[PDB]
Each structure stands twice: as structure tokens, then as C-alpha cells.
Amino acid sequence: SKIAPQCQNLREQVNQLIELLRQEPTLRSQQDTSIVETALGKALSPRF
């Protein structure tokens, strides 16, 4: 019901953020994506 035109490309943007995090060597050591791993899609196309 709250789907918005901005949300269509919102998820593709964070995919870039994950890409930047992975590129940096030392950042991969102490950054776990397990939280976002079960957050975005749980929100977009929500599951209640």
C-alpha cells in the first residue's frame, strides 16, 4: 500500500553499498551483513 516510485531503485542502491564494503580488504574482517541479509526483502515485498 505504501509502495513508492523511489522504492523501485532503493534496493539496487544498497547493493552498491555492499559492493563498496567488499572491495576494501580490511573492512571485510569486522563487518557482517547477516543483519541486512534478512532485512531488506523482509521489508520490500513484505512478509507479515
Partner: protein, 69 residues
């Protein structure tokens, strides 16, 4: 007391090669300094859009990057 006594002459001998190192080193410094500058621009654009979309329903916003100086 004599090995260091001739510091002057060694400078002239070394003066031949010091030019290349100075220009080469800064070029490497500039290349990496400019390379990292490119990454933050990509990061800045994505986060601004994220907050813009989420602004429609919530006020939980992330940080920008500006006037790093």
C-alpha cells in the same frame, strides 16, 4: 668523523636521481588520493537517495560526507 665529513659530495652525486623519486612518489600519492576520492563520490550519491526515499515515512537518516577538509 670522516665518513660523515663528506656529506656534501654525496649530495651532488645523489642529486642526479632525486628528481625522479620526488615526482614519481607524488604521482603515486596523487593517484591513490584521487582514486579514493572517486569512491566516496559513489558512496555519497547512494546514501542521499536512500535517505530521500526513507524520508517519506521515517526520520531515521544516515550520515552525509561533506567539507572533509
Amino acid at each position: 668523523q670522516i665518513i660523515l665529513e663528506q656529506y656534501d659530495v654525496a649530495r651532488k652525486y645523489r642529486e642526479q636521481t632525486l628528481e625522479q623519486d620526488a615526482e614519481e612518489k607524488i604521482a603515486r600519492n596523487s593517484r591513490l588520493q584521487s582514486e579514493i576520492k572517486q569512491k566516496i563520490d559513489l558512496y555519497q550519491t547512494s546514501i542521499v537517495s536512500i535517505n530521500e526515499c526513507l524520508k517519506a515515512m521515517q526520520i531515521f537518516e544516515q550520515l552525509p560526507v561533506i567539507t572533509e577538509s
